[PDB]
């Protein structure tokens, strides 16, 4: 009954690849999506008009790190969120409560929200889903996510099913307290942990409601990567075809790859940024370590296919020297580079699944990323050879 926001351009025949269009207010957005942090909270960081000279047209953004206290700050702009940026394009933004329940261990989650004691005075403040989703409201992102109830996934116990169905009711908190769906989407949280039981029950109760689009959680936990694999590949396939899957927390490129073929459609991780700091550059082959002295005489750019700025005017060796001398101007090179190889990335799995040529696509990338690509990892492989794809 509601307009879906998302258009299936072409799906590959043997995995579950799909490559796709999302029609959000302020544009369409080619998916596959890897979706970088466009929050400038970070001093070392890409601003938002170098995302979208790279051609970035969704970023992620919330207002945790501004304000006095910790949680989601209204901003009181008359632009919202976008003006508060400067960003033309789309912001999806999540609700906050997973940066408050990590980042301070005091705050403690009941069905009410998430409750948090002031560390100058113990004032409390109190995160509910009317709260967040009110916030969300005032910041005007295209996508928002639901408040959700977030366990570790090597968490075992009661918990994990507490936190699973606290989920499902604070999704249906969300829904009513949105106003604005003709201009903001609010997506669900598929909860359950590493149990098949729980996450399954998960997926069956929450597409029972017309939102959106959906995301995968919990995942990227520490757990197993056969575990992990596995439970993409159920809330995939228990997940509606036509609407967005976000999958949250993943961005090392074979993650990316794998999980494309498993029917996932948005990704995010601060990945490139991390990976930029240990001055290193990401490439089709990995990563080069920049820092290493057998680049200091190597002149050549850090991948002449790379079409990004720090690619068209710095060489290798430059960069090395850089960051010998001025570590932080090599971290912005270096992250510039990372964020246009993770968008190049996707924009090139993207093209493989339009023209019928995905599983090559795969071979290709695992033969490039790990010498030859039957070696692969073992769980990389399991979770392909479960969709239909056969390395070499
Ligand atoms: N709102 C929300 N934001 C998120 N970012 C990343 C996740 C990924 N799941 C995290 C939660 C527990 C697992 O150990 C994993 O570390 C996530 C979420 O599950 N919910
Ligand atoms: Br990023
Ligand atoms: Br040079
Ligand atoms: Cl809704
Ligand atoms: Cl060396
Ligand atoms: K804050
Ligand atoms: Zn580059």
């Keep these: 009954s509601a307009p879906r926001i998302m258009r299936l ?38 601003t938002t008009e170098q995302l979208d000279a790279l051609g970035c047209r969704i970023c992620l953004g919330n207002t945790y790190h501004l304000g ?38 005091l705050s403690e989650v009941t069905e009410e929200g998430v409750r948090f004691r ?18 969300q409201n005032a910041l005007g992102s295209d996508i928002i996510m639901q408040l959700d109830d977030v366990v570790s996934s090597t968490v ?39 149990d098949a039981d729980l996450r399954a029950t998960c997926l069956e109760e929450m597409t029972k409601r017309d939102v959106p689009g959906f995301a995968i959680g919990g995942l990227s936990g520490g ?34 790859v794998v999980c494309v073929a498993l029917g996932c459609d948005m990704f995010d991780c ?7 700091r240990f001055g290193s550059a990401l490439v089709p082959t990995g990563n080069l370590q920049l820092r290493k002295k057998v680049f200091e005489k190597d002149f050549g750019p850090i991948d002449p296919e790379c079409t990004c700025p720090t690619c068209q005017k710095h060489s290798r060796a430059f960069l090395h020297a850089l960051l010998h001398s001025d570590n932080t101007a090599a971290l912005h090179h270096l992250t510039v580079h990372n964020i246009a190889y993770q968008l190049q990335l996707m924009s090139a799995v993207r093209t493989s699944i339009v023209e ?21 990892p073992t769980w990389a492989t399991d979770a392909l050879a479960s969709v239909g794809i056969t390395l070499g």
């Design 9 to 46: 351009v072409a799906e590959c025949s043997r995995s579950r690849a799909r490559a796709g269009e999302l029609w959000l207010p302020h544009g369409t957005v080619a998916t596959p999506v890897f979706m970088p942090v466009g929050t400038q909270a970070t001093m070392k960081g890409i």
């Design 68 to 105: 006095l206290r910790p949680g989601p700050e209204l901003i009181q702009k008359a632009n919202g969120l976008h003006g508060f940026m400067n960003w033309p394009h789309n912001l999806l933004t999540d609700s906050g409560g997973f940066q408050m329940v990590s980042l301070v261990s």
């Design 118 to 135: 002031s560390p100058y005075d113990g004032n409390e403040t109190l995160l509910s889903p009317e709260k967040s989703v009110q916030i």
């Design 156 to 194: 075992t116990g009661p918990r994990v099913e507490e936190a699973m169905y606290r989920s499902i009711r604070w999704l249906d908190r969300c829904i009513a307290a949105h106003q604005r769906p003709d201009k903001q989407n609010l997506f669900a949280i598929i909860q359950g942990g590493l």
């Design 223 to 256: 757990e197993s990567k056969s575990q992990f694999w596995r439970m993409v590949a159920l809330s995939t396939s228990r997940l509606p075809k036509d609407k967005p899957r976000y999958l949250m927390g993943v961005g090392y490129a074979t993650d990316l």
């Design 270 to 276: 601060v990945f490139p940024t991390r990976t930029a």
């Design 356 to 376: 019928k040529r995905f599983p090559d696509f795969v071979r290709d990338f695992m033969g490039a990323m790990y010498g030859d690509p039957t070696l692969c």
